[PDB]
Amino acid sequence: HMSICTSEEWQGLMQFTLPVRLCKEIELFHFDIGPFENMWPGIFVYMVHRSCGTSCFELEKLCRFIMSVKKNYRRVPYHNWKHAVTVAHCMYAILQNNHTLFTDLERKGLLIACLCHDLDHRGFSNSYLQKFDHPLAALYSTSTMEQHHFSQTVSILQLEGHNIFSTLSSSEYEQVLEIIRKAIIATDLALYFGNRKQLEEMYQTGSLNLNNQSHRDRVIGLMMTACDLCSVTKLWPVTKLTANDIYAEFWAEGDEMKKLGIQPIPMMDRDKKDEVPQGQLGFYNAVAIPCYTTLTQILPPTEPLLKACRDNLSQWEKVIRGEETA
Ligand SMILES: Nc1nc2c(ncn2[C@@H]2O[C@H](COP(=O)(O)O)[C@@H](O)[C@H]2O)c(=O)[nH]1
Numbered sequence: 001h002m003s004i005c006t007s008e009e010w011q012g013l014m015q016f017t018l019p020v021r022l023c024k025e026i027e028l029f030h031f032d033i034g035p036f037e038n039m040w041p042g043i044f045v046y047m048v049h050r051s052c053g054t055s056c057f058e059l060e061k062l063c064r065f066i067m068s069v070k071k072n073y074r075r076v077p078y079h080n081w082k083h084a085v086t087v088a089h090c091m092y093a094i095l096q097n098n099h100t101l102f103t104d105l106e107r108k109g110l111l112i113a114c115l116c117h118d119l120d121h122r123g124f125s126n127s128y129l130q131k132f133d134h135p136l137a138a139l140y141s142t143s144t145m146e147q148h149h150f151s152q153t154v155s156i157l158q159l160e161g162h163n164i165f166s167t168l169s170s171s172e173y174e175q176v177l178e179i180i181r182k183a184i185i186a187t188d189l190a191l192y193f194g195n196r197k198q199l200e201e202m203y204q205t206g207s208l209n210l211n212n213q214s215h216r217d218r219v220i221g222l223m224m225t226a227c228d229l230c231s232v233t234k235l236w237p238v239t240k241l242t243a244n245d246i247y248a249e250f251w252a253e254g255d256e257m258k259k260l261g262i263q264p265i266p267m268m269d270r271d272k273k274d275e276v277p278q279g280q281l282g283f284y285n286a287v288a289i290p291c292y293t294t295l296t297q298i299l300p301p302t303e304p305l306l307k308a309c310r311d312n313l314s315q316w317e318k319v320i321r322g323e324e325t326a
């Protein structure tokens, strides 16, 4: 099922060295990997090593894992390899800024989860899959694609010489797969609404306790949401360019629905682009802003993401007022 990287791909990755100038910039939240496509795999290797240590993973296995994961992301407009690395970098930044709050096991697992969270995405949402009795919606009744993404992750790990977690004790092994499982499922936005309200409630009543595994799971879940949506925390021009990619997939889905005799929601209707600005305002107010607000409360060092998100919210309002530019 899973595609496999060539020997030239993983072998070449092992010899990669991150340019000195980027070492500085990669630590910042607003960092945009966009202008460095050839370096994305190497950037991930770098983040893993800085966060988890150069010997955490056997280099050969890690490189095969990375290049195969890349080969298993499809050439879709948004849920692609570029997105995977973007999300992993946000997680890297969050972990670097809250290092000792998370275990070595969790950091390894979360960085890997972020790189694999949208594995083998076809370009169709859970709505489509369920509303069209796709085999996946039957196998996975809820969080359909997310369960599939996790399934894909384990399949890659099982490929020969690809299991980077085998050196963990039998106990930590199962523990890390559970961390990855929950983390990937948490990227199902449907689950975000409940998770955020819960955390907010926990935080304000003073109940939140990081030594409480159920609370840890929720915090990690919000972190995944935060990283998944981080394109809204970049400089405006970057945020805007990514938005076009997001909508390219939305509109493509809408077109397929029309062909199947079912009118799509406005957001997925390429004939209703005029409604995009207002729709983004809604998404920021109902999802992005609350997410980063709650995350900042729990992990103060992540405040730059909230500030950036608010700045972009202001940009969308500026568009609606007819003051946009370029
Ligand atoms: N309307 C809207 N949806 C977004 C935006 N950013 C992310 N999303 C949605 O949030 C989802 C997060 O889940 P994932 O990216 O892991 O599939 C994306 O797939 C996409 O459907 C945005 O700026 N606007």
Ligand SMILES: [Mg+2]
Residues within 6 Å of the ligand: 117, 118, 145, 146, 187
């Ligand atoms: Mg996803």
Ligand SMILES: [Zn+2]
Residues within 6 Å of the ligand: 083, 087, 117, 118, 187, 228
């Ligand atoms: Zn994603």
